[PDB]
Write a protein that binds this ligand. Structure first.
Ligand SMILES: *[C@H]1O[C@H](CO)[C@@H](O)[C@H](O)[C@H]1NC(C)=O
Length: 209
């Protein structure tokens, strides 16, 4: 026995903004008084149904308000059990922007900004400058977080973040690569999302042999 179970078990459960997830808390009770309760604050765009798997917590079209700790407490026979789970709501960037859009082997730097993101802290969001399938050696860094304000007519509502990462560029090299790549990776409990965005390297350094 347990005798209180939650499906899924994971202590941390990640859900994409606007998606859905349902947690089923079950209690094996030999007695009459058996009672199950879901708490924390409640919300998410979630609900609670009982008697068809004890009590299921369903988060629908998740919002950032969904995130937070949820607790299922089950009472049975003057005895009480629990299971605590953290809902982690996140938003992977829907666009990646590279400045300059293309790289004449000139030289300066390059910036890559991810749009509409959460979370934005390292350990959960990293950027990479790639040449082929490996990170460009000699590239530096510095990443700024920004908040975005929007809500244009006849549909929806809300606010997220725009993170940019800049890189002072090394010489590059011979033979100049056809393109460099910016990659934004998000690593959450159980998952890893990634976005690779091409940045064309202009085959211009001419003039010699
Ligand atoms: C919940 O909110 C999201 C974004 O604000 C929206 O796309 C979705 O349709 C909403 N769900 C409902 C039932 O309104």
């Amino acid at each position: 026995v347990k005798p209180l179970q939650v499906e899924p078990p994971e202590p941390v459960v990640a859900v994409a903004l606007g998606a859905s997830r349902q947690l089923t808390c079950r209690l094996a009770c030999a007695d009459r008084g058996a009672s199950v309760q879901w708490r924390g604050l409640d919300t998410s765009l979630g609900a609670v149904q009982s008697d068809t798997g004890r009590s299921v917590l369903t988060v629908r079209n998740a919002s950032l308000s969904a995130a937070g700790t949820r607790v299922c407490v089950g009472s049975c026979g003057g005895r009480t059990f629990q299971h605590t789970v953290q809902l982690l709501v996140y938003a992977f960037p829907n666009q990646l922007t590279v400045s300059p859009a293309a790289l004449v082997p000139g030289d300066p730097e390059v910036a890559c900004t991810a749009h509409k993101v959460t979370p934005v802290d390292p350990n959960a969001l990293s950027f990479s400058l790639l040449v082929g399938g490996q990170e460009l050696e000699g590239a530096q860094a510095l990443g700024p977080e920004v908040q975005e304000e929007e809500e244009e007519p006849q549909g929806d509502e809300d606010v997220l973040f725009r993170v940019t990462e800049r890189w002072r560029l090394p010489p590059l090299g011979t033979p100049v690569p056809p393109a460099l790549y910016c990659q934004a990776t998000m690593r959450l409990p159980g998952l890893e999302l990634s976005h690779r965005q091409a940045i064309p390297v202009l085959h211009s350094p001419t003039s010699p042999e």
